Design an enzyme around this catalytic site. Sequence first.
Site, PDB file in Angstrom:
ATOM      1  N   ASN A  47      -7.308  10.166  -5.575  1.00 35.57           N
ATOM      2  CA  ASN A  47      -8.013   9.158  -6.708  1.00 35.57           C
ATOM      3  C   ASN A  47      -8.983   9.788  -7.399  1.00 35.57           C
ATOM      4  O   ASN A  47      -9.565  11.652  -6.809  1.00 35.57           O
ATOM      5  CB  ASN A  47      -8.817   8.022  -5.527  1.00 35.57           C
ATOM      6  CG  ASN A  47      -8.049   7.250  -4.952  1.00 35.57           C
ATOM      7  OD1 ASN A  47      -6.980   6.442  -5.287  1.00 35.57           O
ATOM      8  ND2 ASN A  47      -8.052   6.510  -3.095  1.00 35.57           N
ATOM      9  N   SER A  90     -10.541  11.634  -3.945  1.00 39.25           N
ATOM     10  CA  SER A  90     -10.398  11.553  -2.480  1.00 39.25           C
ATOM     11  C   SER A  90      -9.557  11.400  -1.707  1.00 39.25           C
ATOM     12  O   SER A  90      -8.891  10.985  -3.130  1.00 39.25           O
ATOM     13  CB  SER A  90     -12.253   9.966  -2.635  1.00 39.25           C
ATOM     14  OG  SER A  90     -11.870   9.281  -1.627  1.00 39.25           O
ATOM     15  N   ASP A 144     -12.068  10.297  -8.227  1.00 41.93           N
ATOM     16  CA  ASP A 144     -13.016  11.270  -7.305  1.00 41.93           C
ATOM     17  C   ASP A 144     -12.770  11.936  -6.372  1.00 41.93           C
ATOM     18  O   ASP A 144     -13.432  12.136  -5.417  1.00 41.93           O
ATOM     19  CB  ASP A 144     -14.436   9.532  -6.937  1.00 41.93           C
ATOM     20  CG  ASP A 144     -15.113   9.072  -8.703  1.00 41.93           C
ATOM     21  OD1 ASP A 144     -14.218   8.446  -9.185  1.00 41.93           O
ATOM     22  OD2 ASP A 144     -16.105   9.135  -8.114  1.00 41.93           O
ATOM     23  N   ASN A 194      -8.592   5.526   3.368  1.00 37.05           N
ATOM     24  CA  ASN A 194     -10.269   6.444   2.728  1.00 37.05           C
ATOM     25  C   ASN A 194     -10.338   7.567   2.870  1.00 37.05           C
ATOM     26  O   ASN A 194     -10.772   7.564   4.150  1.00 37.05           O
ATOM     27  CB  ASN A 194     -10.780   5.296   1.383  1.00 37.05           C
ATOM     28  CG  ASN A 194     -11.107   6.849  -0.306  1.00 37.05           C
ATOM     29  OD1 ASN A 194     -10.198   7.026  -0.762  1.00 37.05           O
ATOM     30  ND2 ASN A 194     -12.163   7.380   0.176  1.00 37.05           N
ATOM     31  N   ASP A 238      -6.442   8.281  -0.405  1.00 37.79           N
ATOM     32  CA  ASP A 238      -5.672   7.685   0.704  1.00 37.79           C
ATOM     33  C   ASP A 238      -4.494   8.288   1.983  1.00 37.79           C
ATOM     34  O   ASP A 238      -3.682   8.589   0.933  1.00 37.79           O
ATOM     35  CB  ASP A 238      -5.419   6.719  -0.210  1.00 37.79           C
ATOM     36  CG  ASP A 238      -6.476   5.909  -1.149  1.00 37.79           C
ATOM     37  OD1 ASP A 238      -8.185   6.283  -1.083  1.00 37.79           O
ATOM     38  OD2 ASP A 238      -6.351   5.362  -1.934  1.00 37.79           O
ATOM     39  N   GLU A 297       1.071  -1.276   0.073  1.00 35.96           N
ATOM     40  CA  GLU A 297      -0.182   0.105  -0.447  1.00 35.96           C
ATOM     41  C   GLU A 297       0.880   1.219  -0.006  1.00 35.96           C
ATOM     42  O   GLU A 297       1.013   2.050  -1.200  1.00 35.96           O
ATOM     43  CB  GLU A 297      -1.149  -0.222   1.277  1.00 35.96           C
ATOM     44  CG  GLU A 297      -2.464  -0.720   1.539  1.00 35.96           C
ATOM     45  CD  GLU A 297      -3.077  -0.519  -0.055  1.00 35.96           C
ATOM     46  OE1 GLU A 297      -3.106   0.515  -0.910  1.00 35.96           O
ATOM     47  OE2 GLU A 297      -4.143  -1.039  -0.424  1.00 35.96           O
TER      48      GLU A 297
END
Length: 129
Positions: free
Chosen positions: A46, A50, A48, A59, A52, A35
Amino acid sequence: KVFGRCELAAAMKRHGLDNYRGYSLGNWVCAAKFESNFNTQATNRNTDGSTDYGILQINSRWWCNDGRTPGSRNLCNIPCSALLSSDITASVNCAKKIVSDGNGMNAWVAWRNRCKGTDVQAWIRGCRL
């Protein structure tokens, strides 16, 4: 901060990381490896819009508040900034929430892809554990 493998396994076990929900330490170390590659400051944005954050890349849509995420909830009840520290506490407490939210470790795309059905015990190799 960048954790050496065993120091991270170490940190995780200490936070009650192993076999937590029947997931052996090995799974967790592997998840973080793919990760964030053990970097506490890792971030991925991301489409959208968003984000991480952290070692386990949680998220901002559902788990933390970074503000900027439109249709967002803050289920862990913390600033996404918390997830970017050197102490793992925050990330592990949140992860614990996510792990039992009806999909096991499948929540982590990298774990799913790179750790699931593998010899995870290798990730705990030569670890003074």
